[PDB]
Design a protein around this ligand. Structure first.
Ligand code: CA
Lengths: 9, 222, 223, 6
């Protein structure tokens, strides 16, 4: 788990 | 100073990549009492996202150094405390000036999502019980934003997608439910694709980028 | 707190990319009264350099936006200036009331005088009228003194001597408005480095080679 | 122009 993406970034 | 100039200085701040200054200006513009336009709204999340992003990154670097075999802890706590200061500031700004202080469904979902994100960040650094409380206040904000988006917005509206994206990150990294995160991310993606046709060049670029983020997460999660 | 832990926190801060915190940690270390080691001096410069690098880049954005001449924009740029000057000022106090001369070896002496020249240079960039002139002078005198010592104590390839020469040349071109002098210094600094490199082992070859490149790039861009 | 450190 390498940190998921969120929005805005 | 005047709201008009406060808004102007934020734009300048973002230009010079001085997010801390940018977030302060926007805060001054908010306390002026008047609602923010779509453009203004984005200035607000961009400023605070950048400020808090730096701290979250600092925190992660430190906490990992702490776990990987006195100073580390003391410094992690300083960073943590500074990060909680910003989140409380953003959350206070939302609770007494932005949330449901308007009418539009988009503005309402936007603010409630923002409340979910900052409680989520507070949750990343909290421990037992305090964490449970924070986690639950994060979810109710996301869920309320979600309820409004599913009744007021089409499956491709970028705000709704941004909300669903972040709510899935919440399930996976915070609520410890990989199952739920994956299905929501997948379900959000499909219903999004199934409508991509004639999504208008309006919010095209935005929803398109979030749809890709959803995929990246699905891949990393599986 | 203990000096050793201040240094450790500066290293943690650097990894966390919190240069402002780092700078403040090294400042505490410097105030302990003990000389800085080579690694410690680099920590000190990395810190403040990154802090100031950000203000500068910001000032340069707000300036072009303002177009040097042709409200809000003016007020904000001035605030970024004040800040830049604040950082420069605490760095200069650190050097003048602690680090300079309290050192022995040539290396450190040149390193601090260079640093002193570097920050007066940053003050110059945002200065106008006669203020700039006075600033340019004190920057020149610090760089010169550093130059006088490096030419007398170190070989043409010492990375620190090269760095000083590099920055001093940049000063001549971008600040002192003396291109020719800026070019000759760079040329000479580079050549003298060559006719001596045939004996410079990788024990430091890499270092000089890196800086030597920056000298030719500037030489190329100034022509 | 290039300066060191960068
Ligand atoms: Ca208020």
């Amino acid at each position: 788990m390498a940190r998921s993406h969120s929005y805005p970034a | 100073m005047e709201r008009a100039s406060l808004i102007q200085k934020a734009k300048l701040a973002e230009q010079a990549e001085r997010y801390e200054d940018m977030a302060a200006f926007m805060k001054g513009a908010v306390e002026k009492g008047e609602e923010l336009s779509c453009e203004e709204r984005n200035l607000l999340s961009v400023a605070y996202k950048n400020v808090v992003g730096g701290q979250r990154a600092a925190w992660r670097v430190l906490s990992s150094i702490e776990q990987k075999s006195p100073e580390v802890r003391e410094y992690r706590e300083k960073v943590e405390t500074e990060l909680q200061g910003v989140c409380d500031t953003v959350l206070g700004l939302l609770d007494s000036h932005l949330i449901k202080e308007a009418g539009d469904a988009e503005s309402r979902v936007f603010y409630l999502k923002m409340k979910g994100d900052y409680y989520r960040y507070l949750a990343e650094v909290a421990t037992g019980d305090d964490k449970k409380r924070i986690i639950d206040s994060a979810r109710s904000a996301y869920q309320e934003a979600m309820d409004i988006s599913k009744k007021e917005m089409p499956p491709t509206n970028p705000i709704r997608l941004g909300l669903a994206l972040n709510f899935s990150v919440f399930h996976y990294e915070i609520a410890n439910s990989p199952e739920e995160a994956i299905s929501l991310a997948k379900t959000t993606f499909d219903e999004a694709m199934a409508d991509l046709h004639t999504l208008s060049e309006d919010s095209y670029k935005d929803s398109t980028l979030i749809m890709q983020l959803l995929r990246d997460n699905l891949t990393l999660w599986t």
